[PDB]
Amino acid sequence: SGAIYVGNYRVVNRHLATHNDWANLVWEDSSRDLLVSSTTAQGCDTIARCDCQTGVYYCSSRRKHYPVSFSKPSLIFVEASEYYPARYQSHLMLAVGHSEPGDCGGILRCQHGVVGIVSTGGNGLVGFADVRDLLWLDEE
């Protein structure tokens, strides 16, 4: 579990979005495993605006933050998981690291702020849904 809180937005994995999220929907994209809902309180997170490929992510199944190198966002085949069939996911970054289904929502951060959230795992990789291209998260 986990979310990003920026302005009056909450960014969650689409597959973990609640009824309240869907009832307050701003934007969602199944291909990216992202959903954004509206919030009452202002959030603490700053979104990175950069093409970093190094950062640190939170792994809830280890209670640990790990430094990782990660691929630039691209369109990647993902094998079946507990929460999706095998399918293509867009805007996905991969690193070598541990990720189980419950790790989804852990933040990946670089020197510029939040890069994305854990979205995929298995076969010794962790996949992150990028948010750095969502410039609208920083206004209105």
Ligand X SMILES: N[C@H]1CCN(S(=O)(=O)c2ccccc2)C1
Instruction: Identify the residue among 16, 47, 78, 110 touching Zn ion (CB under 5 A).
Output: 110
84 binds, among ligand X, Zn ion, none (CB under 5 to 8 A by kind): ligand X
From residue 82, alpha-carbon distances to 64, 109, 110, 129 in Å are 22, 25, 28, 17
Q: With CB under 6 A as the rule, give the number of residues binding ligand X.
A: 10
73 near ligand X, rule: CB under 6 A: yes
Handedness of CA 33, 39, 45, 51 (dihedral sign): positive
125 binds, among ligand X, Zn ion, none (CB under 5 to 8 A by kind): none
Q: Give how far the C-alpha of residue 59 lies from the chain's centroid of Cα atoms, to the nearest Å.
A: 12
Closest distance between Zn ion and the C-beta of residue 112, in Å? Answer: 3
33 belongs to the catalytic site: yes
Q: How far apart are CA 125 and CA 122, in angstroms?
A: 6
132 near ligand X, rule: CB under 6 A: no
AA identity, residue 47:
I
Q: How far apart are CA 140 and CA 124, in angstroms?
A: 39
27 binds, among ligand X, Zn ion, none (CB under 5 to 8 A by kind): none
What residues line the site for ligand X (CB under 6 A)?
73-75, 80, 82-85, 90-91
